[PDB]
Amino acid sequence: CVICDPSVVLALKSLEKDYLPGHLDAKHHKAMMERVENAVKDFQELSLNEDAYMGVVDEATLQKGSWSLLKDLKRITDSDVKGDLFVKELFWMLHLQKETFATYVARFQKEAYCPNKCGVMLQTLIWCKNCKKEVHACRKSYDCGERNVEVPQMEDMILDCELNWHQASEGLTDYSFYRVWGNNTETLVSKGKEATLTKPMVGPEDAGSYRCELGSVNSSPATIINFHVTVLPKM
Numbered sequence: 001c002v003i004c005d006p007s008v009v010l011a012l013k014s015l016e017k018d019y020l021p022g023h024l025d026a027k028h029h030k031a032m033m034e035r036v037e038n039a040v041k042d043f044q045e046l047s048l049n050e051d052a053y054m055g056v057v058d059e060a061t062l063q064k065g066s067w068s069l070l071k072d073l074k075r076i077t078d079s080d081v082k083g084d085l086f087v088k089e090l091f092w093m094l095h096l097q098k099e100t101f102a103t104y105v106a107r108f109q110k111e112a113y114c115p116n117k118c119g120v121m122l123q124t125l126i127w128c129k130n131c132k133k134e135v136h137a138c139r140k141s142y143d144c145g146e147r148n149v150e151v152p153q154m155e156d157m158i159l160d161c162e163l164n165w166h167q168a169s170e171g172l173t174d175y176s177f178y179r180v181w182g183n184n185t186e187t188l189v190s191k192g193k194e195a196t197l198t199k200p201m202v203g204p205e206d207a208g209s210y211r212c213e214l215g216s217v218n219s220s221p222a223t224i225i226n227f228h229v230t231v232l233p234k235m
């Protein structure tokens with residue numbers, strides 16, 4: 001999918017126009033550039049071993065692959081290699097970079113694709129084949145796992161509602177921190193773009209149940225996390 005990057009396109013249009021004139025006989029120009037353009041488009045034809053390949057990457061994986069490629073391409077052109085050497089070098093590199101990209105896409109699916117273990121992530125994906133950008137909802141369980149927090153008598157109580165995937169999600173609004181009373185009732189304690197809640201130098205009253213919601217425009221919460229806080233009469 002790496003031809004979806006405007007930079008890759010120009011670097012190709014620079015190889016043809018700036019590099020080929022002084023480093024390959026003109027008989028090979030149209031033919032080899034025909035082959036190069038086709039090779040790079042073929043970055044989207046992937047097999048992937050197992051699991052199967054979906055035809056989507058996130059924008060990071062896409063950038064990642066364009067970088068590998070264009071740094072490699074560039075090494076060649078700083079080298080000033082000509083003729084046959086140049087063609088071999090050029091075509092080894094394309095071959096390696098495809099295989100490399102393949103490993104990006106594989107890693108992307110195993111680890112970056114709908115990476116959330118709970119909640120609902122809005123992931124911006126891109127379709128290899130048409131360079132088209134979509135937003136896809138990864139909907140998982142609402143159970144992020146219960147956070148049991150032990151905090152010493154008079155130290156800070158930090159409640160972190162941040163998940164690693166939150167920074168990669170679309171449509172987030174605010175984190176709202178609730179206090180749950182035992183009444184099966186609650187009070188809004190905090191709300192903003194802060195992912196944490198700190199009641200410093202806490203005390204025995206401050207123990208109990210807390211709750212974090214992460215909102216999304218404009219619908220159901222992206223994340224719910226529950227904390228149970230127990231304060232310890234201790235050092």
Ligand SMILES: *[C@@H]1O[C@H](CO)[C@@H](O)[C@H](O)[C@H]1NC(C)=O
Nearest residue numbers: 180181182183184185186187
């Ligand atoms: C619910 O229980 C807590 C217990 O401390 C209390 O502070 C709160 O006022 C109760 N709810 C209402 C509506 O009073």
